[PDB]
Amino acid sequence: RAPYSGPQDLAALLEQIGCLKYLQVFEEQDVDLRIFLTLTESDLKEIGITAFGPKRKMTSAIARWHS
């Protein structure tokens, strides 16, 4: 199998956590994977992610893939 070291773009990360419905929010804010992986919960709020569920999934993903 092809070596893998995690999502290589934001859409891939969002698909992995079931959050593709937020892809456009990040595209309109011009936030790519590199920037996403630096975000705080406060940042996610500023971007437009207010619902508890998606915020929690995204903060968990950021912790997992930050590296």
Residue numbers in the entry: 2 to 68
Reproduce the article's own wording on this structure.
Recent work has revealed that ANKS6 interacts with a related protein called ANKS3. Both ANKS6 and ANKS3 have a similar domain structure, with ankyrin repeats at the N-terminus and a SAM domain at the C-terminus. Here we define the ANKS6/ANKS3 interaction by discovering that the ANKS6 SAM domain binds to the SAM domain of ANKS3.
We therefore used a strategy that has proven successful for a number of other SAM domain polymers, where we attempt to crystallize SAM domains with mutations in the polymer interface. We were able to obtain a crystal structure of the L52A mutant. Each SAM domain has the characteristic five α-helical fold and chains in the asymmetric unit are nearly identical (RMSD of 0.29 Å on backbone atoms and 0.3 Å on all atoms). Examination of the crystal packing reveals a triple helix of intertwined SAM polymers.
